[PDB]
Each structure stands twice: as C-alpha cells, then as structure tokens.
Amino acid sequence: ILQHPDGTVLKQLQPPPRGPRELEFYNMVYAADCFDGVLLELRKYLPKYYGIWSPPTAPNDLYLKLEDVTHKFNKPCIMDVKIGQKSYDPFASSEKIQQQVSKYPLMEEIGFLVLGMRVYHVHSDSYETENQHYGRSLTKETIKDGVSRFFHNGYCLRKDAVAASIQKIEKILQWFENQKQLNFYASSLLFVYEGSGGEVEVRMIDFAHVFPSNTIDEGYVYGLKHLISVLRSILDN
Ligand SMILES: Nc1ncnc2c1ncn2[C@@H]1O[C@H](COP(=O)(O)OP(=O)(O)O)[C@@H](O)[C@H]1O
Ligand SMILES: O=P(O)(O)O[C@@H]1[C@H](O)[C@H](O)[C@@H](OP(=O)(O)O)[C@H](OP(=O)(O)O)[C@H]1O
Ligand SMILES: [Mg+2]
Ligand SMILES: [Mg+2]
C-alpha cells in the first residue's frame, strides 16, 4: 500500500487470481453504467475507486487507486478487522483451508479477527500499534478487552467512537441483510476515529476473495452481529 498526498492510496494487485479478482470487484461495483440498486448502495461503504493505475513508465506494474479513508483525520486511530466465519474461499485447496484455519482456529466461533490497530495516546502525543499476532491471540475470554483497547486513548475509553462504530456497522449489516448476490471471504472492516470529537469511518476493504452467490453471506452476518454485540458491551464499561 502506498500513500499519496492527493488523498488516495495505491494498492498493488496481489498475484493472480487474487489481484485480478479484486480489480474486477471494484470494476463491477463502480461500473459507470451500473443501475443495480444493491451495488449502488454498496458504494457508500467502500473506498471511492479511481480505477486501475500504473506508473507512466511501467504499464506492467498494476495498482488500484482508492480513497484514503484516513485522509480527513488529524490523528487517525485505525483498526482493521477481518470479518466472517471462514477466511478461505470456496475454491481453496485443503492446504489453504488448513493454513487459514490454523491462523485463527477461533474464526468460526467468533466471526471476526483483529488484524491490527494504531491508536493515538493523547498524554504522549504518540501512537501505539498492535500487529497480526495481537488479534490472533484473542480468545472468547479476552475478545472484549482486546477490541476495547482500540478505543482507549491512554486516559479514557472513547465510548463516542464505540457508539458511532456500532451505528455505522449497523448500516453495513442492513446492506448484507438485503443482498444475496455476493459473498465476502477474507474481507475487512477498516475503522477510523479521530484521536486528537465525532468523525468516524467504518469502510469495507480488501476484496481479493469476493464471489458471486445465491445465498445470504451468513458468515459475514454472524461476524458483524457478534462484533456489534462486543462493541455494545463495551458501552457498559
Ligand atoms: N482505502 C484505504 N484507506 C486507508 N487505508 C487503507 C485503505 N486500504 C487499505 N488500507 C490500509 O492498508 C492495509 C492493507 O490493505 P488491504 O487491502 O487489507 O491489503 P492486504 O490484501 O495486503 O491485506 C489495511 O489494513 C489498511 O490499514
Ligand atoms: O498475515 P500472515 O500471517 O502473513 O498470513 C496471511 C494472511 O492470512 C492473509 O490474509 C492471507 O491472504 P488471503 O487473505 O488472500 O488468503 C495470506 O495467505 P497467502 O500466504 O496465501 O498469501 C496469509 O499468508
Ligand atoms: Mg487485508
Ligand atoms: Mg487481503
């Protein structure tokens, strides 16, 4: 991921089939001639898409040019959370299924996995970050405190940002409850709040494993509902 000062990010296409699939996901949703109401609403929850991009001197080198969801913040606090009961897609080999389940065998039970976070601490005017091994070390017993950490700025828990997050996830959940045409594996919600105070973003990102479907994405629903339940209990702290 490359950050550009024009308020965008450039995401390098992953090797095939993943990179091509994500490109085609964005091309589908943001198709200029799209009048599918489900896809038009979905746009609200994704980064704005500016199309494929390459360097003028390197057509081989493929990126997606996307809205940088953090751009409008002064001290953005960011968390990436993978959503769903399965982080492997319908065409995964046994090996890949085993890889992905062994990254976090609790995915079926919890329905989400924190991939990382960067949190602004007001007293020190500095950031603390957690990596992939943080959220993968979270159990049912520790998931609530694990998530809460994102919203604590070194002296108070930001219940405003927790409540806003629930409210935004709720709209995404509603989108999911009214579509049966796409199922999302290994996708994420990107959470941003202002660390320095009410602006909050929750956007869907990372679409290398989105597939057409004829069913509700029950894994994705389960994950969102559980994530909301956790966030709700944090409001009682
Ligand atoms: N549109 C965006 N705006 C701001 N930050 C982003 C955006 N897309 C990705 N990021 C950051 O880059 C990270 C990796 O992006 P992602 O699409 O999840 O790539 P990967 O396929 O490598 O998991 C995310 O966790 C997030 O922190
Ligand atoms: O973060 P880690 O521990 O390096 O593990 C990676 C993480 O689970 C990625 O989401 C996954 O890509 P997908 O989500 O696209 O499967 C990748 O699979 P890969 O090794 O097959 O690229 C893993 O290696
Ligand atoms: Mg990702
Ligand atoms: Mg990915």
Which residue's alpha carbon is at the smallest distance from atom 18 of ligand 1? Answer: 206
Long-range contacts of 233-236 (CB under 8 A, 24+ apart): 233/144, 234/144, 234/147, 234/148, 234/151, 234/157, 234/159, 234/162, 235/159, 235/162, 235/163, 235/166
Which residues, at least 6 apart from 107, have a Cβ–Cβ distance to it below 8 Å? 84, 85, 86, 87, 100, 101, 113
Q: How was this structure determined?
A: X-ray
* Dist CA 21 CA 181 (whole Å): 16
Q: Which two tokens stand for residue 235?
A: 């409001």
User: Which neighbouring-strand residues pair with 83?
Assistant: 112, 187
| Nearest listed ligand to the Cα of residue 107 | 2
**Was 18 annotated as part of a binding site?**
yes
| Nearest listed ligand to the Cα of residue 15 | 2
For residues 234 and 162, the answer to whether their CB atoms sit within 8 Å is: yes
User: Which neighbouring-strand residues pair with 130?
Assistant: 117
Using alpha carbons, select from 45, 15, 11 the residue that is nearest to residue 201: 45
Which residues, at least 6 apart from 217, have a Cβ–Cβ distance to it below 8 Å? 84, 176, 182, 183, 184
- Which residue blocks in the chain are alpha helix, DSSP H? 18-29, 37-42, 94-103, 107-110, 132-136, 143-148, 159-177, 218-234
Cβ neighbour number for residue 215 with a 10 Å cutoff:
8
Which residue's alpha carbon is at the smallest distance from atom 23 of ligand 2? Answer: 100
Q: Which residue, chain included where needed, has tokens 């091994």?
A: 133
Helix (H, G, I), strand (E, B) or coil at 219: helix
| Nearest listed ligand to the Cα of residue 87 | 2
* Ligand 2 closest atom vs CA 115: 1
Helix (H, G, I), strand (E, B) or coil at 12: strand
CB of 187 sitting under 6 A from ligand 1: no
Which residue's alpha carbon is at the smallest distance from atom 13 of ligand 1? Answer: 1
Which residues, at least 6 apart from 32, have a Cβ–Cβ distance to it below 8 Å? none
- Final resolution, Å: 1.9
For residues 210 and 219, the answer to whether their CB atoms sit within 8 Å is: no
Helix axes 159-177 and 218-234, enclosed angle (nearest 10): 160
* Dist CA 109 CA 218 (whole Å): 13
For residues 187 and 84, the answer to whether their CB atoms sit within 8 Å is: yes
CB of 83 sitting under 6 A from ligand 1: no
